[PDB]
Design a protein around this ligand. Structure first.
Ligand SMILES: *[C@@H]1O[C@H](CO)[C@@H](O[C@@H]2O[C@H](CO)[C@@H](O[C@@H]3O[C@H](CO)[C@@H](O)[C@H](O)[C@@H]3O)[C@H](O)[C@H]2NC(C)=O)[C@H](O)[C@H]1NC(C)=O
Ligand code: CA
Ligand code: CA
Ligand code: MG
Lengths: 909, 510
């Protein structure tokens, strides 16, 4: 139809603006149309939004500045536009530093109609901007972690029994630390006298294995070299060679009993190192030698003790569990509680969006409250919003609403003098549903108004409110279930008629794709394309991105269906089906997105864009023309035996009001097909030249009128044996033949909903008082031999009908005898004078119609006489009403009707 | 019923009851050569004998029909007979196909165990790592060649499905003192094998895992098990897929929440380690996609789910033919009896389905599966029988109906659901007529140039007539109809130039 598939515009396939979605945006001040496309961020293109223009027969895309910049992985971009501006939201991950959770919501920016910034909004910490009393109108990854190193002495002064106690204390401390801490590992070395490396924090991932490794230690014992142990810890344990985190909190735990002796390194040397510009150190010096000698000062130098928090002097290993709690208190991390209720952390606000007006937007929140869903009604200037959801009345229905995904799709229904927000919940009760915000008092909640019927079909994932006649009030709502299953994932669109009195929904129609495609995903994308067909009625495009998937040689797949809106609703069948194969090679998922209603090619007619996964396709709309034909027969009445030239003055005229078709029939060609005497088996008229009534490709170019001069001749002598008393009907069958190639301007297309033929009739002057019609009266005077009887006394029931014609002339008159099938004719008698033909049909089970072919144009003012002798066909019937009706039908221009009835009564039940 | 037609081909295409006659110019008694298309009696009584009329009737010929044999020991069991038939049907005529199905005993079965590992299945895994020997022994009672495999799934490893915190990605468990593995989407752990020791060892090597949201990515695992035939190890025997979970599943539109726009492409994506590593690049499969893949692979899913998840999988099994749903215990302690009950309820049922009918062709079934005389009603899209016993042979009556014509011999592929056995129907349409009466430029019909091209002799363009003898005498004179009754009394119908009667009365006198 309108869409000019032969000349599309494509963005380059190199994926510079790798297209996820595409829409057309117009500024209603300068009438400037753009081709905003959304892309996933990469190294080449970081921007989420680009603006594309048709320059020099090519789509050139430029990034739109002042929009939020995605970071890292692609998480989701939504862009919606209205006459109030363009709204773009990106899903942003924010990780809480002191928590094992994460926030996943949207950072939105509102642009003006000229793509200039208006407002910015991030919905992290949503409870701050959540004022619930604002009445709704409704028209009324680096890891910080923690790393702990334990230095366990194993000198010869320690007996083997004490080694077991120290090992058990170390294991218990590690277990309690793992209980209270999560993102924090352990490592240790054996401070026995030979510097050996035990399991490091690389092996600390497997906690159970680390416990066994700790339990598998053995004390050798050479000499207490504390400084060497610290230096080895610095060189191996805390170095990133085995995965140590650079910014991890480093805690040193030293439990020693013997002072430094035979140590080449100095204790004061290893502590004053440049790498120790902030490191936690602890010294739990069990031993009476510390209390009784100078080596207490050695203990103090081991670990800094500003408040004596690190210094832990104990008398024996039996109190290790006694001071384990104190040791845990100042080292453990108290990381944020994990398992808190999911209210707004993963609400994903801005998943779907809708601009309500200049300052207000409607943002979907799929993940709020355990993925129950919702919608944020946000005012961008006051920076305050309120949350709308199902508002369950208990704890059973709060859990029953979870994972319903409300706010997956959000739309607005426009009414006489009020608005109505709607939201889709594509897995509500596993079918999907459409919720509508119904206000009462000051609390507004989404209640279900429509539901799906198939499990997993995703009913309500796509919402398309359609206002057909553009009066400001939506007439239809299109709801898609794109994964509807018959044999594969076919797709289904539900058309709902909005009631004008209250706003209720009635299922008008169910739409489907072309048969023979088990995988289509019909309805995955739908949009109101404005007016494409130039009839001032909104039309709809529905994409099926999976049609033809799995084709050989990597063929393009996907389809778009165009539905023209009529005064009674949408079309029964799509006017157009644009397959990706006929657009361009290598188009994957053609039909993922669509938008239209604005002129981007400069021709003045609004055209569309279709987004594939990776590219955006732009199609221009063709002008629509409707022609008006007219004959001007010169004789205007064929005389008796004319045998003369009949002059024809065909004159095609452009009846369309689509201005002047710009380079339209300037290049397209009209194609006539004159069908003289259509319907008659033996035509009594034919064209003088047989080459001007089979196909005639004439060039129109300039001018709104194309006139011709044809000629009609009789056929092979034109004997009047046929029905000369009937108008000869001639059918003009025009057609449009577009050229081949890339035309600079779109070529016109005939209107699909106007029939392209112009049947005209020239009348034979019927020989009568008025030589344009012969009307005669068919009077009948049938006589009944006997009115009725029963029980074999009927014998041969007899009837007699005599048809009398005494008017001007009777032409192909008809008979009609209506008698019940309870009686049957043994013999039938024809009217002798004259031998008038009568094609009597067989009896019928229903009310009898003996449409006998009496009359014929030859019929003079004579009369007929038909004799009928009936007998019951082994049937007995009681008294009835309306008796037997006989009708005479004349097929002239003026119809004369004759009616006759008999009397029937027998007195025998 | 039947009306006068120009030629034999159009006459037979008009109605199945037409009985076009081909006698050598016996219409040389004042009759137009276009009224030889009526029923059998009106053409047998009117001139031509049994030899000189051709009423074409379609037929079916069996190409290969091997007998229903129960292999040797579950080895070469043939269950569907016949296996290739050629059906030629005249438009408008029924064609009855007799399809027999035998439930051979000891038919081999492959059972792939596809487990959920979302930390609510810790005790379930503890039981399953020992239940392998019991499962193999119990399944060996109904069949002799049984092979079992193991797989697992958690979810797609992106937000909001699993917590992608690096510390919570290595250890997705609430506490660090217990052993568990990082979340994955589908890990093919064990290929279908006949020894239970490998099952025990491989499943015991596995650990529990965890994710963030309640629904799981089990559809990805189901699709990858159905598609990756070489890696799973499926054979051409009955295939069971035991799907055990205690929560719902993600469907095709759910991946958009994680920024996943690419539809699942229906290709095998298992790497060398058995992992479905590129699962974050495709969305979840849909119910329709999963059902199509399962039907195309002849795999019968068994959903062993808990009581809280039962209705969802009941709906899903209503959407999937040849599926079973059982109620799983909180620790999978009843999974073997559940599997046995599901397998018995699946084997007791026999279904016959058609691949795809060509335009204008209709199919109907008559499930005669108890008693050689008792058959149920017609007009169904499936040859369904339940409670079929071992060694019992069922019968299906498949009726084929073509309306206009079929240009190409489209192959029909009737098959029994859950079995690789197939019945190929070569569907030709007998809508061309060969009465053999046609002779090129026959001297007997017409004059000089021109050929009959049909049973009726085609008039030569040089002159009009039966043999071009009379251009207008035979064509124009209507006295031949006016001869049509006396003494017929209505019990006999009129004949052109005569009155035809029946019931011991005949001829114009009748
Ligand atoms: C619709 O949204 C409202 C909020 O706009 C949800 O109400 C909130 O529900 C949560 C629970 O999911 C409540 O948190 C709990 O509050 C109780 C006290 O009532 C407390 O004991 C718990 O520890 C927890 O904090 C929250 O208070 C409540 N807020 C309000 C204003 O009602 C509601 O659940 C949503 N409905 C659905 C169906 O999703
Ligand atoms: Ca469990
Ligand atoms: Ca999950
Ligand atoms: Mg779970």
């Amino acid at each position: 139809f309108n869409v000019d598939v032969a000349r599309p515009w494509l963005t380059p396939k190199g994926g510079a603006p790798f297209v996820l979605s595409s829409l057309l945006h117009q500024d209603p001040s300068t009438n400037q149309t753009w081709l905003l496309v959304t892309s996933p961020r990469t190294k080449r293109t970081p921007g989420p939004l680009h603006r594309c223009s048709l320059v020099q027969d090519e789509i050139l895309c430029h990034p739109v500045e002042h929009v939020p910049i995605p970071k890292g992985r692609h998480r989701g971009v939504t862009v919606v536009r209205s006459h109030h501006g363009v709204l773009i939201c990106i899903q942003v991950l924010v990780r809480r530093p002191h928590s094992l959770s994460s926030e996943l919501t949207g950072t939105c920016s509102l642009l003006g109609p000229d793509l200039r910034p208006q407002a910015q909004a991030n919905f992290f910490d949503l409870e701050n901007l959540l004022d619930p009393d604002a009445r709704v109108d409704t028209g009324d990854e680096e890891e910080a972690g923690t790393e702990i190193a334990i230095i366990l002495d194993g000198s010869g002064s320690i007996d083997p029994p004490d080694f077991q106690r120290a090992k058990d204390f170390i294991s218990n401390m590690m277990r309690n630390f793992y209980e209270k801490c999560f993102e924090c590992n352990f490592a240790l070395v054996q401070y026995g006298g030979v510097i050996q490396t035990e399991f490091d924090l690389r092996d600390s991932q497997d906690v159970m294995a680390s416990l066994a490794r700790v339990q598998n230690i053995t004390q050798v014992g050479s000499v207490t070299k504390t400084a060497s142990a610290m230096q080895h810890v610095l060189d191996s344990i805390f170095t990133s060679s085995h995965g140590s985190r650079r910014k991890a909190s480093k805690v040193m735990v030293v439990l020693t009993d013997g002072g430094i002796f035979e140590d080449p390194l100095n204790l004061t040397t290893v502590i004053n190192s440049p790498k120790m510009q902030g490191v936690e150190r602890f010294a739990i010096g069990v031993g009476e030698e510390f209390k009784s000698a100078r080596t207490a000062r050695e203990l103090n130098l081991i670990a800094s003790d500003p408040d004596e928090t690190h210094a832990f002097k104990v008398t024996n290993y039996m109190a290790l569990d006694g001071l384990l709690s104190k040791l845990r208190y100042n080292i453990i991390s108290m990381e944020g509680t994990v398992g808190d209720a999911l209210h707004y952390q993963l609400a994903q606000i801005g998943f779907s969006a809708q601009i309500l007006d200049e300052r207000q937007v409607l943002l979907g929140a799929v993940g709020a409250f355990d993925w129950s869903g919702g919608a944020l009604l946000y005012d961008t200037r006051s920076r305050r919003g309120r949350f709308l959801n199902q508002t369950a009345a208990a704890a059973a229905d709060a859990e029953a609403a979870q994972y319903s995904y409300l706010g997956y799709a959000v739309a607005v229904l426009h009414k006489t003098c009020s608005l109505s927000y709607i939201a889709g919940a594509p897995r509500y009760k596993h079918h999907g549903a459409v919720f509508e915000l119904q206000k009462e008092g000051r609390e507004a909640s989404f209640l279900p108004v429509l539901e799906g019927e198939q499990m997993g079909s995703y009913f309500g994932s796509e919402l398309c409110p359609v206002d057909i006649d553009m009066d400001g009030s939506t007439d239809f709502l299109l709801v898609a279930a794109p994964f509807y299953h018959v044999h594969g994932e076919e797709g289904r669109v539900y058309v709902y008629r909005l009631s004008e009195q209250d706003g209720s929904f009635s299922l008008a129609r169910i739409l489907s794709g072309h048969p023979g495609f088990t995988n289509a995903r019909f309805g995955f994308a739908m949009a109101a394309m404005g007016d494409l067909s130039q009839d001032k009625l909104t039309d709809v495009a529905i994409g099926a991105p999976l049609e033809g998937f799995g084709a050989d040689d990597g063929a393009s797949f996907g389809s778009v269906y165009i539905y023209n809106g009529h005064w009674d609703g949408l079309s029964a069948s799509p006017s157009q089906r644009i397959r990706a194969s006929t657009v361009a090679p290598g188009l994957q998922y053609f039909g993922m997105s669509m938008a239209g209603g604005f002129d981007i090619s400069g021709d003045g007619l609004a055209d569309i864009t279709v987004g594939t996964l990776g590219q955006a396709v732009v199609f221009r709309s063709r002008p629509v023309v409707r022609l008006k034909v007219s004959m001007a027969f010169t004789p205007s009445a064929l005389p008796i035996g004319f045998n003369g030239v009949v002059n024809v003055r065909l004159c095609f005229e452009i009846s369309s009001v689509t201005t002047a078709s710009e380079s339209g029939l300037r290049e397209a060609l009209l194609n006539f097909t004159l069908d003289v005497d259509v319907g008659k088996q033996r035509r009594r008229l034919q064209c003088s030249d047989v080459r001007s009534c089979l196909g005639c490709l004439r060039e129109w170019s300039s001018g709104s009128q194309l006139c011709e001069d044809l000629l009609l001749m009789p056929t092979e002598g034109e004997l009047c044996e046929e029905d000369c008393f009937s108008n000869a009907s001639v059918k003009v069958s025009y057609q449009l033949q577009t050229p081949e190639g890339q035309t600079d301007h779109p070529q016109p297309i005939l209107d699909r909903y106007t029939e392209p033929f112009a049947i005209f009739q020239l009348p034979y002057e019927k020989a009568c008082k008025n030589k344009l019609f012969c009307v005669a009266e068919l009077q009948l005077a049938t006589t009944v031999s006997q009115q009725e009887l029963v029980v074999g006394l009927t014998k041969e029931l007899t009837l007699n009908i005599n048809l009398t014609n005494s008017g001007e002339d009777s032409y192909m008159t008809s008979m009609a005898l209506n008698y019940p099938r309870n009686l049957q004719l043994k013999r039938m008698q024809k009217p002798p004078s004259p031998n008038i033909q009568c094609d009597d049909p067989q009896p019928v089970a229903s009310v009898l119609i003996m449409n006998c072919r009496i009359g014929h144009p030859v019929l003079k003012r004579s009369s007929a006489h038909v004799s009928v002798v009936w007998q019951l066909e082994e049937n007995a019937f009681p008294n009835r009403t309306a008796d037997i009706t006989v009708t005479v039908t004349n097929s002239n221009e003026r119809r004369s009707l004759a009616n006759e009835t008999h009397t029937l009564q027998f007195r025998h039940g | 019923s039947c009306q006068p037609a120009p030629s034999c081909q159009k006459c037979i295409l008009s109605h199945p009851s037409c009985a076009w006659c081909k006698q050598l110019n016996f219409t040389a008694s004042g009759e137009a050569e276009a009224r030889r298309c009526a029923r059998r009696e009106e053409l047998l009584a009117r001139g031509c004998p049994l030899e000189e009329l051709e009423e074409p009737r379609g037929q079916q010929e069996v190409l290969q029909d091997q007998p229903l044999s129960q292999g040797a020991r579950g080895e070469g069991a043939t269950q569907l007979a016949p296996q290739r038939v050629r059906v030629t049907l005249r438009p408008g005529e029924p064609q009855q196909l007799q399809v027999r199905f035998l439930r051979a005993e000891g038919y081999p079965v492959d059972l792939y165990y596809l487990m959920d590992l979302s930390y609510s299945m810790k005790d379930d895994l503890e039981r399953v790592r020992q239940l392998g020997h019991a499962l193999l022994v119990r399944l060996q009672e109904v069949t002799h060649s049984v092979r079992i495999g193991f797989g697992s799934f958690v979810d797609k490893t992106v937000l909001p499905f699993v917590s992608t915190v690096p510390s919570k990605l290595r250890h997705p468990c609430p506490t660090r003192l217990e052993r568990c593995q990082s979340p994955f989407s589908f890990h093919h752990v064990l290929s279908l094998t006949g020894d239970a020791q490998a099952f025990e060892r491989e499943v015991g090597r596995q650990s529990v895992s965890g994710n963030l949201d309640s629904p799981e990515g089990g559809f990805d695992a189901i699709l990858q098990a159905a598609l990756c035939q070489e890696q799973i190890g499926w054979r051409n025997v009955s295939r069971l897929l035991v799907f055990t979970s205690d929560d719902t599943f993600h469907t095709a539109g759910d991946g958009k929440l994680g920024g996943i726009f690419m539809p699942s492409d229906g290709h095998c994506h298992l790497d060398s380690n058995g992992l479905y590593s590129r699962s974050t690049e495709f969305d979840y499969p849909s119910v329709g996609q999963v059902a199509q893949a399962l039907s195309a692979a002849n795999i019968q899913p068994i959903f062993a789910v808990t009581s809280a998840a039962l209705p969802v999988y009941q709906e899903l099994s209503k959407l999937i033919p040849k599926s079973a749903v059982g109620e799983l215990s909180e620790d999978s302690s009843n999974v073997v009896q559940l599997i046995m009950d599901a397998y018995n309820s699946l084997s007791s049922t026999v279904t016959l389905e058609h691949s795809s009918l060509p335009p204008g062709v209709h199919i109907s079934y008559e499930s005669q599966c108890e008693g050689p005389e008792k058959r149920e009603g017609k007009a169904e899209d499936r040859g369904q029988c339940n409670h079929v016993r071992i060694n019992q042979t069922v019968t299906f009556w498949v009726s084929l109906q073509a309306t206009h014509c079929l240009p190409e011999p489209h192959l029909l592929r009737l098959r029994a659901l859950g079995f690789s056995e197939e019945l190929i129907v070569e569907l030709h349409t007998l809508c061309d007529c060969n009465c053999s009466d046609t002779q090129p430029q026959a001297p007997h019909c017409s004059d000089g140039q021109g050929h009959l091209q049909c049973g009726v002799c085609s008039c030569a363009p040089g002159r009009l007539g039966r043999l071009c003898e009379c251009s207008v005498a035979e064509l124009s004179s209507p006295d031949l109809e006016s001869g049509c009754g006396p003494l017929c009394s209505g019990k006999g119908h009129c004949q052109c130039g005569r009155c035809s009667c029946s019931g011991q009365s005949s001829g114009h006198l009748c």
